[PDB]
Amino acid sequence: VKIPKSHPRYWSLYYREKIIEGMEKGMTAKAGLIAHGRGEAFDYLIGERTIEPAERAMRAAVAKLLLAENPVVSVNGNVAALVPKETIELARALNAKLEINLFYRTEDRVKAIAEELRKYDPEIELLGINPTKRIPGLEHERGKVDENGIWKADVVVVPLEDGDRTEALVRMGKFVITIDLNPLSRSARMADITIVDNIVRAYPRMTELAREMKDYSRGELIRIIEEYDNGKTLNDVLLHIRDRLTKLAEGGIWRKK
């Protein structure tokens, strides 16, 4: 660990290392490294915390997940590098299935992800090891899915997802929840609930939420879901980024700080 606990970018920097390792364990694609950067820049803009518009989406997503009939949490190379333990914990609290789901699928990459998750829960049912069914639209099996998971699923969480896949799953009729720091991504705009938070914070938080909201009665959960407006929430995120820009600038930019 090449930097000090006092460092103002400590956590950011720590996760950069985690996604690098991820790659050289065979988990995270190169393309994923670019996506990690995309996330970094936007986190910095958002303020590297869980903003209210994100808290709001997460209350609603967890309620929707808890009322679901066959909820699946997806995993890919980035998630496996960054929050292997927390994704298991979240799937456990939801009693949701975990399905590995990649755009750059490989038996090798699939196996690296599996082994990494097993490190944390050797017992865990993993789906998408050998996926038979496929999503209408998409492409050369860059849209392959397991038949006992996302194929079957009414409600999916698809973190850090590609826009083609999010939009396609919606057209199937899946209720899609995404976690994505970029509110302007196609995936963010096409999801049913879009949580604009870093997944390193979103998952542990959704886990806390699920642990409290388990005790909520159905009607309570349905009130939350029915109140929720994903359009206003995205709009609130853009204006939040807008206002942090004018705050970061103030006192002038050029030379320097």
Name the site residues for a second copy (rule: CB under 8 A): 9, 16, 19-20, 23, 30-31, 33-42, 44-45, 182-186, 188-190, 194, 230-231, 234-236, 238-239, 241-242, 245-246, 248-250, 252-257
Interface with ligand ATP (CB under 6 A): 9, 31, 35-36, 38-39, 42, 82, 160-163, 179-182, 185-187, 198-200
Q: Which is nearer to a second copy, 40 or 116 (CB)?
A: 40
Smallest distance, Å, CB 164 to ligand ATP?
A: 6
Smallest distance, Å, CB 187 to a second copy?
A: 11
Q: Residue 200, CB half-sphere, CA atoms under 13 Å: how many? A: 18
53 binds, among a second copy, Mg ion, ligand ATP, none (CB under 5 to 8 A by kind): none
Phi/psi zone of residue 208: left (φ > 0), alpha (ψ -120 to 50 degrees), beta? Answer: alpha
218 vs 16: CA distance, rounded Å = 40
Relative to beta strand 155-157, strand 144-145 is unpaired
Q: Which is nearer to a second copy, 11 or 44 (CB)?
A: 44
Smallest distance, Å, CB 120 to a second copy?
A: 24
127 vs 74: CA distance, rounded Å = 9
Q: Which is nearer to a second copy, 3 or 245 (CB)?
A: 245
Angle at alpha carbon of residue 125, lines to 119 and 126, rounded to 5°: 80
Which residues participate in the annotated binding site for ATP? 16, 38, 180-181, 186-187, 198-199
